[PDB]
Design a protein around this nucleic acid. Structure first.
Length: 244
DNA sequence: CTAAAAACATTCGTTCACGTGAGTTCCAGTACAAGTCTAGTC
């Protein structure tokens, strides 16, 4: 299916766009139902959840008598669902706005977040939006730039910051969007250097052996006088064995 | 006949509940060492 929205570069410029999920992990659509061993029916087994206090009597409390709460460092602060909904962050949903433009070298693949990749094309049938999107894509490609944008599926969806970069092919062109991390989503860890360690420094013979191993295990071959690498093990085209 | 208002069907995102493997650390449990064993006279 297509997700329609309006790419915004300012306050008076908007381009109708449609986004599809180019890449998304595929799961099993069918689940497993618990059934009784003696008789293979799910209606003979009932699953229920109960709530009890911290007393030896195991006093039972109804669901309606339960309040949501959060921990505040050894102190419990009650926070009802209605209060949270009233005070939760609110934003205008269904937005695709361009926060800015930055050099592609400033965005690194290792920082990509999320579990999906979006492909954004022009609207269904209109030459104006197609021309505008093509102009934007070509400008970004020529200038070596990407668009830092704000993405929100709808009102409920939590807004996110992502990077959209051009993707031009001989038959089609589009914008590839991938989510970007927040400041608190980054983990700052320290790792000991390996290039300046006198105990883990490999010798010349070891380096030669590793080079020979790498040469002998190349999954890409050079074609005959055409300068076009050929993949010998294209794992991207292999179906997931779990389904089979 | 006609369009439009209502109802119905689908996909997605978010939330929550449960189950489970892995890493860290805190503590109950165990083991072991050392002291005690009555008070007095002659």
């Amino acid at each position: 299916i297509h997700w329609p929205c309006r790419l915004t570069i300012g306050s008076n410029l908007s381009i109708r766009i449609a986004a599809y999920k180019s890449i998304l992990q595929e799961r099993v659509k069918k689940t497993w139902t618990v059934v009784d061993a003696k008789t293979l029916k799910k209606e003979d087994i009932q699953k229920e959840t109960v709530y009890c206090l911290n007393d030896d009597d195991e006093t039972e409390v109804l669901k309606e008598d339960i309040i949501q709460g959060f921990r505040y460092g050894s102190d419990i602060v009650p926070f009802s669902k209605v209060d949270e909904e009233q005070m939760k962050y609110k934003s205008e949903g269904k937005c695709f706005s361009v926060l800015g433009f930055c050099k592609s070298s400033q965005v690194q693949r290792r920082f990509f977040m999320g579990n999906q990749v979006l492909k954004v094309f022009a609207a269904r049938d209109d030459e104006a939006a197609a021309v505008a999107l093509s102009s934007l894509i070509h400008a970004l490609d020529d200038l070596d730039m990407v668009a830092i944008v704000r993405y929100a599926y709808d009102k409920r969806a939590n807004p996110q910051v992502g990077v959209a970069f051009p993707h031009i092919k001989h038959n089609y062109e589009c914008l590839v969007y991938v989510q970007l991390p927040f400041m608190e989503d980054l983990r700052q860890y320290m790792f000991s250097s390996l290039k300046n360690s006198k105990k883990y420094a490999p010798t010349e013979a070891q380096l030669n052996a590793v080079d020979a191993l790498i040469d002998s295990m190349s999954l890409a071959k050079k074609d005959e006088k055409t300068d076009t690498l050929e993949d010998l093990f294209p794992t991207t085209k292999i179906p997931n064995p779990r389904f089979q």
